[PDB]
Amino acid sequence: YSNNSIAIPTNFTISVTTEILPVSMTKTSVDCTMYICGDSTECSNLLLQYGSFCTQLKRALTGIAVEQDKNTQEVFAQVKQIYKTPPIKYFGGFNFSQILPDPSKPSKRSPIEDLLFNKVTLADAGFIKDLICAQKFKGLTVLPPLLTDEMIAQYTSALLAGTITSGWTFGAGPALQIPFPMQMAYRFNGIGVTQNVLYENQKLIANQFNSAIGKIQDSLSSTPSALGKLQDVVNHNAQALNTLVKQLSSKFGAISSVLNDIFSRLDPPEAEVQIDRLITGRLQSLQTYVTQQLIRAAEIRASANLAATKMSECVLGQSKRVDFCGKGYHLMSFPQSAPHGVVFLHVTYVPAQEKNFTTAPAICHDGKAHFPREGVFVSNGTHWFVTQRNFYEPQIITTDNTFVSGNCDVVIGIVNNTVYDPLQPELD
């Protein structure tokens, strides 16, 4: 730190990063009279006392199940038109072949969505019915989602095609087409760099972007801990179901855990107290399960709302909120689909190679004081120039760069120099 020293970058870098987010969890269903009394007719008549509880547990689970479908729909089904990308893939030198659909594969998924789909190992592949058998025998069911996994891929394909062919215009009205190298110029202008920087470094920027994408692909395979957030959901659900099922072999103080064994070997009026003991234990087990599911559903909903907001604000626009869509100055984002979640790829701008200069707040020329319009004054030891604040590019000080205000008696660190007035030579 000093009070007349400033540092300015002379160079830049393009960066690509990732972000994982859960969206939905597993849908479940229960039947008390099968779970509690299995196939006994004597236990059904006794359970018929507690005739207002099972209705309530079933209502809770049904609510959760519907909320999951609502979550997924809110996140993905934002636009109601299915755009398509042109058959000639030339976009000014940028190379999007790693995020666009692959027609050769039987499932039209991009090369990265296959890595994402293979790195998350699931439990129930196939809903036409093992950790899924005994449960079904015990009254517990797993329901299939409403949107198959070949519909979500179409939605993400539509989003990508629209964004790379029209910009941000398709999220606020009718889609309007524009060349791609001339959309990146708008984005550069939006982060604070003049647009002639892109047209003069176009082939460097294209190469940097392509290399960044290559690294993104190679990195996911290694370090098998990227997908932790999406694996935790599966683990939690499986563990909860195992506990619930195995809880059926406890006596809770009775003489046995088998209903027919209790009914025989005892006379009715004291067999019934044992049976009621079992019934209360199992009801309490169900209620614990349902409460835990409700809390987890609330957490997943918070996450899904966050994901929907990121979709709206980073993919369909260009945000100025800091660190919302990655580290750096945001340029643009791309979505990808993953089991039970979504993945964002954020593309950002980073300054690279800085230098020292001395600076001043104003210039006194003829008793007037000049201030920069859109830049900052710098000196390299001998001469004074005016430059933009995010990229070193010096120019001469003229009456077109600066504006006048007052006289130079009041400003603290004012210095002396000349201002050009680009009119003398042309008329004289």
Binding site: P86, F127, P144, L146, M151, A175
Partner: protein, 87 residues
């Protein structure tokens, strides 16, 4: 009404609901016609069509159902939206 059996092959339903000792009004929903096989199970009492509309009652796994016009209940594959292409 239409009935959905969530985990069976309704070739093989009459053996699962024990259709032999049920009321003659339940046996209409065991073999009947309009049988259709989905991924969530399978469905009896609704007719499958080839159009695509937007979802009304969600059956699951991509299939939805509706009541429209002689009247009957139809089942179909939900549509995602119109098709369009930028130039």
């Amino acid at each position: 009404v239409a009935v959905l059996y969530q985990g069976v092959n309704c070739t093989e339903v009459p053996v699962a609901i024990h259709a032999d000792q049920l009321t003659p009004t339940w046996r209409v929903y065991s073999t009947g016609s309009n049988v259709f096989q989905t991924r969530a199970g399978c469905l009896i009492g609704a007719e499958y069509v080839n159009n695509s509309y937007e979802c009304d009652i969600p059956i699951g796994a991509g299939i939805c159902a509706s009541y429209q016009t002689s009247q009957s209940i139809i089942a179909y594959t939900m549509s995602l939206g119109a098709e369009n292409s930028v130039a």
